[PDB]
Design an enzyme around this catalytic site. Structure first.
Site, PDB file in Angstrom:
ATOM      1  N   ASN B  91      70.123 136.663  12.757  1.00 52.34           N
ATOM      2  CA  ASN B  91      70.793 135.775  11.965  1.00 52.34           C
ATOM      3  C   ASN B  91      71.997 136.280  11.214  1.00 52.34           C
ATOM      4  OD1 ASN B  91      68.886 134.104  12.880  1.00 52.34           O
ATOM      5  ND2 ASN B  91      67.569 134.367  11.136  1.00 52.34           N
ATOM      6  N   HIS B 108      73.839 140.766  14.677  1.00 48.49           N
ATOM      7  CA  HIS B 108      74.764 139.918  15.165  1.00 48.49           C
ATOM      8  C   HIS B 108      76.014 139.640  13.883  1.00 48.49           C
ATOM      9  CE1 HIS B 108      72.092 137.980  18.223  1.00 48.49           C
ATOM     10  NE2 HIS B 108      72.871 139.053  18.673  1.00 48.49           N
ATOM     11  N   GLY B 175      60.786 132.855  15.293  1.00 52.69           N
ATOM     12  CA  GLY B 175      62.085 131.865  15.605  1.00 52.69           C
ATOM     13  C   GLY B 175      63.158 132.235  16.678  1.00 52.69           C
ATOM     14  N   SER B 177      64.834 131.924  20.287  1.00 52.59           N
ATOM     15  CA  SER B 177      64.872 131.182  21.313  1.00 52.59           C
ATOM     16  C   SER B 177      64.609 131.713  22.759  1.00 52.59           C
ATOM     17  CB  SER B 177      66.324 130.548  21.499  1.00 52.59           C
ATOM     18  OG  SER B 177      67.199 131.378  21.940  1.00 52.59           O
ATOM     19  N   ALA B 219      57.797 127.364  10.689  1.00 51.90           N
ATOM     20  CA  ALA B 219      57.762 129.000  10.208  1.00 51.90           C
ATOM     21  C   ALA B 219      57.072 129.193   9.007  1.00 51.90           C
ATOM     22  CB  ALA B 219      59.207 129.109  10.322  1.00 51.90           C
TER      23      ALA B 219
END
Ligand SMILES: [Zn+2]
Lengths: 10, 235
Positions: B91, B108, B175, B177, B219
């Site tokens: 994130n 990232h 969380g 993917s 979550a």
């Protein structure tokens, strides 16, 4: 681990 | 105490109001990845891409945006484990930082940072990036780009991450993917080095079958409940 990439290319 | 490495993805910040590429079609704020998430996209339309991240940066700092219970639980986990804890996130938001986590590896990049297009130096940045904004690290001030790792670019802190993956007693993916590599391959590394793998997600990731332990649901409910058992198992 290589570059940031998605599993689907096309 | 066990060495714990936690990987978080977009799913943990969904309840806080931060969205990302949808599962249904891959659009991020109704934008194609290809246009706003690639080096090429930035080169063809720098004005649009800069404006896109300006919007994301502004949205992030809105009053109604707050870390949720899952973010808070991870901060408590670091407090208890200290040096034997490492948090890696895909994130670009700062909700982990706001929750109380420190030494978070943003593989990232970060929305609240920009980068000099000449030196590659990162720079704290909370406002819009205009064409008249330049770097503060070069004699001849260069244009700025978002400090976000785009598809086709190398993620950040990979050396530290793979070292922790080999050392981890417990690896927890939250969380994620399972579509974004190399992040999605981390569970395979952890399991190769004998780590106990745990998945906490709203929906099963596309590598969920590689995890030894898994729990699914919102979550803000699943993560704090898993964290508390763990803290109680530590006694
Ligand atoms: Zn510079």
């Amino acid at each position: 681990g290589g570059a940031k990439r998605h599993r689907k290319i096309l | 105490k066990p060495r714990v490495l936690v990987l978080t993805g977009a799913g943990i910040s969904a309840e806080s109001g931060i969205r990302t590429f949808r599962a249904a079609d891959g659009l991020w704020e109704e934008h194609r990845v290809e246009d706003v998430g690639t080096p090429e996209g930035f080169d063809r339309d720098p004005e649009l891409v800069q404006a896109f991240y300006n919007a994301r940066r502004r949205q992030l700092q809105q009053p109604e945006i707050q870390p949720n219970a899952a973010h808070l639980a991870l901060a408590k986990l670091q407090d208890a484990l200290g040096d034997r804890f490492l948090l890696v996130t895909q994130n670009c938001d700062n909700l982990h930082e706001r929750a109380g986590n420190t030494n978070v590896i943003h593989m990232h990049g970060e929305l609240l940072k920009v980068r000099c297009s000449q030196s590659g130096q990162a720079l704290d940045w909370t406002g819009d990036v205009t064409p008249e904004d330049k770097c503060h690290c070069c004699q001849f001030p260069a244009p700025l780009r978002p400090h976000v790792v785009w598809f086709g670019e190398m993620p950040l802190g990979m050396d530290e991450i793979y070292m922790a993956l080999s050392m981890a007693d417990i690896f927890i993916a939250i969380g994620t993917s399972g579509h974004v590599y190399p992040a999605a391959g981390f569970v395979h590394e952890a399991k190769l080095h004998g780590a106990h793998t745990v998945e906490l997600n709203l929906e099963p990731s596309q590598v969920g079958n590689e995890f030894a332990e898994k729990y699914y649901g919102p979550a803000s409910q699943v993560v704090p409940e898993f964290v508390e058992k763990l803290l109680k198992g530590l006694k």
